[PDB]
Each structure stands twice: as C-alpha cells, then as structure tokens.
Ligand binder design. Structure first.
Ligand SMILES: OC[C@H]1O[C@@H](O[C@H]2[C@H](O)[C@H](O)[C@H](O)O[C@@H]2CO)[C@H](O)[C@@H](O)[C@@H]1O
Ligand SMILES: [Cl-]
Length: 410
C-alpha cells in the first residue's frame, strides 16, 4: 500500500524548489559571475558579494558552471541558460583544455594562462561530466569528442589494473604525482572515495551519450569497487581514504558524501541497465540513507559536516550536504516507499529556505554554524559552484513530477 504525500504538498514543494532555482540560484550566477574583461566567469565572489575578475580560476568550478547551465537549459528551456552554458564552454575549451597533452589544467590565471598544470582525475571527471551534459543539451560534436579524449587519458595514464580504480593525479604530461591531495584538508593517501565517486558520476553521464562497450565495463567495475571496498556494511558509511590495494587508511565519516553516493550509485547502475547488480546497490544505497538519517542530522533536519579522524563531530552546515540530502532523501523515498524519507527531505528543504539560503546577498551561504550564524565565507570560489544546489533543485523537480504522476489519469 502506497503512503504518499497529497498532491497539494508535492506540488507546493516542487514550486518552491523551482522558485529557489530560477529566482535565486541561477539568477545569482547569471548576473553576478560573468566576466566581460577576460570572458567566462569570475573565480571568486567574496562574502560581501564582490566579484573578483582577476582571481585564479579553477577547472572544477568552470566545469560545474558549464554542467549546471547546460542541465538547466536542457530541462527548463530558458534561452539565458544556453547563453551562459555557451559562455562557460567557450572559455573552457580555449583555456582549460590542454591542446597538446590533453585533459584539463587545474587552475588558470584570469586571462587564461595556465597557472597550475597538474592533471587531477577529479578535475578530468568534472570535465567529462560537463562536456557530456553540454552534448546532451545541444548535440555539439566537439564537446563529445573532447569528453571521449579525456576518458581515454584517464584509462591510459591513471587506471590501476592490479587493484582496481585509479591513480588520482598526474602532472601536465600525465606523469603520476606523489601528492594527489585535492587540498590541505585531505589525507595524503593514494586512493580516495571522493575522487572515485566523481569518476563514477562522470562515466555514467558519458555512457548516456556514448554507450561504448569498454566504458560500460569500466563503469561496472567502479560500481563493484564501491560495493566491495568503499561502502562499509557494518557502519553504513563510505570509507574515505585507502592505499593502492583498498586497505582503509581513514576512519572519518562524511555525511554529505554518503547521501550523495546513495543516489549516484543507483543512477549509474540504471544508466548501465545492470539488473544483476541493482539489488545490492539498492541495499547499500538505502543503508547509506538510513545511516545519514540516524547519525548525520541535527534536530532541525539539516546535515552536519563530518566526523573527523579523531572522532570530533563538525556541526557546521555546509551548503552542499544539504543539497545532496534533498536529492538523496527523495531518492530513498522513491526506492523504498518509506515516507519517513520524504519527511526528511521536507525537513532539509525547510532548513535550506530558513537558514542556508542567503536572502540578503543572494544564493546560499557556504557554511552556517550550529547556532544559526552564517560564516563570512566566500560566496563563490574554487570549491563552490552552482552544481550541487542547482542539480539538487533540478533533481527534486523531476522526482516530484514523477511522484505526482502516481495519481493516475482517468
Ligand atoms: O577535500 C577537498 C575539498 O572538498 C570540498 O568539498 C567537496 C566534496 O569533497 C565533494 O567532492 C563534493 O562533491 O563537492 C564538495 C564541494 O566542492 C570542500 O568544500 C573543500 O573545502 C575541500 O578543500
Ligand atoms: Cl558546486
């Protein structure tokens, strides 16, 4: 017997999500971030809302801008979104794409000159994800060919064929780095859940527009790696860092990554159409969602940030785990039929509106303290694009559309 929120409630939530996406998030990005000096988009916007057109620009950020406007154009049709995606795409191919060695640089100066030429797999993945989405939105052939080329370079220079998975960073000419850390925050270990989750994400979107046989095998191997080595059935959490043989080298827990993975793993297995693997993926997915429900939430329904290596709970609410919880909890409801997950989705949405959203300055606060106080962090930077929250809104709109259809037409 189906337990489903009534039509008024589903439609009201869907409407609020659409309003937030179009009138806050995408409006902010389309108006505040374009740079008419160097083209493209600024690399940073400060806490006061001031853009910085001369700040260094990251590949991940720019791929995220491309992905978000491409996906929004595809789903909503608004011409402004195609215009913004095109703007992101042209700068991306001009400056981030290495025309000689292939793949994308980590960071360029505002004028486009390469600043940090490392080829990090996390950044290569976002390039694939964004380029494939731009192809899905516009049918561009160069974009798809480029996404394919980057896939090839990852497999050639990074795949670990003894152990499964990938070396996570190389230099410009694809010679492996000893230091594959994304940032000073990350453990200096050779394998991370974080990078591998985004490889999976990218490969799934690529497979959508280019269903190559070998890609299906690599995508399947990635799903299997998650089930065997990364997801921990005793705890319902993803292990964060490993050695090359996937021996755990971390005890931290990241609620945001758990709940993001909960829906991304199912998206990937469904893009493949891998019916044999689905039940086990579904089981892991629901477990991740339940563990997040039980351990990662404040009494207001928002998500805490992490439990660190020494056990400390970081109670800060970062913007992106809230976004991922919206999608992951709605997904858990769709999978299980258990309305407690819808209730959790509603609770995090109310938190997003009442605390995470920056009503004064536009967009969403990067971080809000446990007492409700916003931190004066940058509004846009290397690590904060429009992708987590933009995607979360697009996903919720579509998932709610499907739930609304459970009232059969007569
Ligand atoms: O640890 C590296 C940086 O991660 C950033 O958080 C990421 C997160 O790791 C995950 O990949 C998610 O999908 O995107 C998040 C936002 O960019 C974090 O904000 C940075 O502080 C870290 O340096
Ligand atoms: Cl983002």
């Amino acid at each position: 017997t189906e337990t489903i929120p009534d039509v008024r409630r589903l439609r009201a939530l869907q409407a609020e999500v659409h309003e937030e996406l179009t009138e806050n998030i995408l409006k902010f990005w389309a108006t505040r971030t374009h740079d008419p000096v160097h083209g493209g988009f600024v690399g940073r916007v400060g806490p006061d809302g001031r853009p910085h057109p001369e700040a260094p620009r990251g590949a991940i950020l720019n791929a995220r801008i491309l992905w978000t406007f491409a996906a929004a154009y595809r789903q909503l049709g608004t011409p402004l979104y195609r215009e913004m995606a095109e703007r992101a795409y042209r700068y991306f191919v001009r400056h981030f794409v290495d025309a000689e060695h292939g793949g994308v640089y980590w960071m360029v100066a505002a004028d486009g000159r390469p600043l940090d030429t490392r080829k990090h797999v996390y950044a290569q993945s976002f390039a694939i994800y964004a380029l494939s989405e731009w192809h899905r939105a516009t049918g561009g052939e160069a974009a798809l060919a480029l996404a394919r080329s980057i896939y090839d370079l990852i497999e050639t220079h990074c795949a670990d064929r003894v152990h499964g998975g990938y070396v996570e960073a190389c230099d410009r000419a694809w010679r492996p780095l000893e230091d594959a850390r994304l940032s000073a925050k990350d453990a200096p270990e050779p394998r991370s859940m974080n990078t591998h989750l985004h490889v999976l994400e990218a490969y799934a979107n690529l497979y959508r527009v280019w269903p190559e046989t070998e890609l299906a095998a690599r995508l399947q191997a990635l799903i299997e790696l998650f089930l065997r080595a990364i997801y921990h059935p005793a705890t319902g959490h993803l292990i964060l860092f490993f050695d090359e043989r996937w021996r755990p080298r971390s005890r931290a827990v990241s609620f945001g990554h758990d709940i993001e993975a909960s829906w991304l793993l199912l998206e990937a297995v469904d893009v493949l159409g891998q019916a044999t693997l689905r039940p086990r993926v579904q089981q892991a997915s629901l477990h991740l969602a339940r563990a997040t429900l039980a351990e990662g939430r404040a009494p207001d329904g928002s998500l805490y940030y992490e439990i660190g290596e020494q056990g400390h709970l970081d109670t800060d609410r970062h913007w992106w785990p809230q976004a991922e919880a919206l999608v992951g909890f709605l997904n858990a409801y769709q999978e299980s039929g258990e309305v407690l997950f819808y209730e959790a989705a509603e609770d995090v949405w109310r938190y997003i509106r009442e605390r995470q959203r920056d009503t004064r300055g536009g967009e969403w606060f990067a971080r809000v303290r446990d007492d409700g106080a916003p931190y004066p962090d940058d509004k846009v930077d290397f690590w904060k694009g429009p992708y987590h929250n933009g995607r979360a809104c697009l996903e919720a709109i579509q998932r709610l559309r499907h739930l609304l259809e459970h009232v059969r037409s007569r």
